[PDB]
């Protein structure tokens, strides 16, 4: 099934649907939770709050992320922040690329990238 409403309140269920569709991708595995202190190279020094697909969703549970620039910056924050402290590894920058591209395709279902 796909989500594609056209209202403010209905957007909560669509932005979250895009979350379930983005986290379900084969590249959201590095964004399905909050980084760590011993596993993360150093997100506490360059990426304080990247808002992966788990924290941004926790806020989207109500209305924290539902205003075009709010849902976009949140996801773009996951991809951007993740790539920022991630050199040309191999699947890290790729997945964020992929998933990000998958998000945009899902955004148009909500109408957030629209003008």
Per the structure, the count of domains in the chain is 1
Distances (CA, A) of 2 to 15, 16, 33, 34, 35: 12, 12, 24, 27, 29
Instruction: Find the domain containing 115 and state its range.
Output: 1-115
Q: How was this structure determined?
A: NMR
CATH of the domain at 28: 1.20.920.10
- Cβ-in-10-Å burial (0-12, 13-18, 19+) of 15 comes to buried
Alpha-helical regions (H) of 51-91: 55-60, 69-84
DSSP 63: T
């Amino acid at each position: 099934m796909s989500k594609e409403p056209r209202d403010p309140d209905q957007l909560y269920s669509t932005l979250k649907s895009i979350l379930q569709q983005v986290k379900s991708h084969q590249s959201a595995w590095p964004f399905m939770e909050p980084v760590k202190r011993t596993e993360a190279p150093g997100y506490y020094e360059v990426i304080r709050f990247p808002m992966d697909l788990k924290t941004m969703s926790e806020r989207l549970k109500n209305r924290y992320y539902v205003s075009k620039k709010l849902f976009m910056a949140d996801l773009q924050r996951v991809f951007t922040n993740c790539k920022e402290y991630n050199p040309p590894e191999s699947e890290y920058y790729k997945c964020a690329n992929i998933l990000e591209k998958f998000f945009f395709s899902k955004i148009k279902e909500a109408g957030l990238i629209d003008k």
